[PDB]
Amino acid sequence: GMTRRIAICAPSTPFTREDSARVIALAAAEFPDLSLSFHEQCFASEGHFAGSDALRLSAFLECANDDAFEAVWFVRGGYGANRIAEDALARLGRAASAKQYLGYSDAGTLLAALYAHRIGRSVHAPMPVDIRRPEGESAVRRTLGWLAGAREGLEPTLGAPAVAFNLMTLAMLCGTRLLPDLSGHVVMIEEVAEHHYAVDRLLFHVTSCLADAGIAGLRLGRVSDVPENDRPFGCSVEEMARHWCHRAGIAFLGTADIGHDVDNRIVPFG
Amino acid sequence: GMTRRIAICAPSTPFTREDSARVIALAAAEFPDLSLSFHEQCFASEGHFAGSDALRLSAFLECANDDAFEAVWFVRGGYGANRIAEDALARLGRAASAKQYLGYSDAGTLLAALYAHRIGRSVHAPMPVDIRRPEGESAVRRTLGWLAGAREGLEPTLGAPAVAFNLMTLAMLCGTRLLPDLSGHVVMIEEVAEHHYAVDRLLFHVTSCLADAGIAGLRLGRVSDVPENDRPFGCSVEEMARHWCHRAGIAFLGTADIGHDVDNRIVPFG
């Protein structure tokens, strides 16, 4: 019976109304104490982005600073949250520390920035856009269950503090003021739609950058939708990760149950 | 009269013998005092790479360490030099410092590494692979002329020390021990075959990483072969560069006559 209100916004790329209706219906049926509020800005489009940087920033702060909501759930995680994150940090109020923030992929930019300042709770979790996947209700109900108080969706190695990032997003965040101090943390990674040489390039960069950071180690989640018409790279993605972790002196801790897929598990930062 | 001997190797991706014959033929007709030697490794093939990491590294060192050559010219610049650059450094002999090293794109990895350690001279310049372009002789002829002693191929703003990098290569090198101290340098960038959102991501990362480096400023070269079927991004590459430079307090100095094209000018590092 205890109710909970969740705000949804589009820090980068846009959603559609019919798909939000689907998410609302699922929650109504399966999590009747949750209440979802999709900000109108979820549905704005200027092409790539869900409105201008000013509009995306504005909608995020409206959600984040409204104490009517216990969570902000990022609707979609295409490129672009880096254009609001720094400005957002300067304008977050007290309400914003009493919230949790949930999503994955580029939205990880916001997860990182909030965690770097200990604002609320940052949580890697499936997003409303996952409703579009085959069996995507399974992903969306994982996050809704989490918001309703269930813990079954936690990534099973959890129980060393953890962060989870999309590999490209982490590479972008390295060397910036948006990355938290990852010393003593397990860093879990996943990737989608990148060539094997691009995954190698990213691993080289991220492992090089984190070599001196004192992390607990790296876990490799799922690397998927790899283009299929390339010449053989010469080794597997796990071989690449182990190779670069060895060179950097970073412990390879094994795998993680995260990815751009409906089985993506929940990882609260820290 | 005086003969100048140039060794050519393939630090990442391979070349073909027919195309190498075309380069030699052009040099024979126009620069009779140049002597080109293509290492056999240029034509090795292990899927993506011009042979194994060990083979590529051995051929690079054979060229660099050989007294018979005044220069090492990188044959092509697809991904992979990062897998030989660090290991090469500890094995470079006395002769390696008496040479020029010339290439662009991924070969910039080696240009960076050698320049970071003041080994010889690093030069951004057209590569033998440019012969495959329409009017490709004009690119290759620029480098040959430079090797023969001409200076007309110099990028027209040169006369502050400069570097020139592929943007993705530079982004990859940020935070790694391979990047030179770029304090007081003009940094020229170019890019090929990246989405507009990808160029934005790279520019955010590079400017964020160089913000505290005290660079003299950035120059924007050509960004080309951009995917045509994306949604409107919302600003031009010049607007992206100016935006991120302003955020980082980096001087936007103007344009540079560099790019993945036959008009690509020569930029000696320093």
From TrEMBL, chains A, B:
UniProt superkingdom: Bacteria
Source organism phylogeny: Bacteria, Pseudomonadati, Pseudomonadota, Alphaproteobacteria, Sphingomonadales
Family annotation (Gene3D superfamilies): Class I glutamine amidotransferase-like, LD-carboxypeptidase A C-terminal domain-like
Cleaved signal peptide residues: none
Entry-linked PANTHER family: MURAMOYLTETRAPEPTIDE CARBOXYPEPTIDASE, MUREIN TETRAPEPTIDE CARBOXYPEPTIDASE
Pfam families registered for this protein in UniProt: Peptidase_S66 (PF02016), Peptidase_S66C (PF17676)
An example Gene Ontology molecular-function term: serine-type peptidase activity
Sequence ranges assigned to domain LD-carboxypeptidase N-terminal in this UniProt record: 6-124
Organism listed in the record: Novosphingobium aromaticivorans (strain ATCC 700278 / DSM 12444 / CCUG 56034 / CIP 105152 / NBRC 16084 / F199)
SUPFAM superfamilies in the cross-refs: Class I glutamine amidotransferase-like, LD-carboxypeptidase A C-terminal domain-like
Protein name: Peptidase U61, LD-carboxypeptidase A
One of the GO BP terms on file: proteolysis
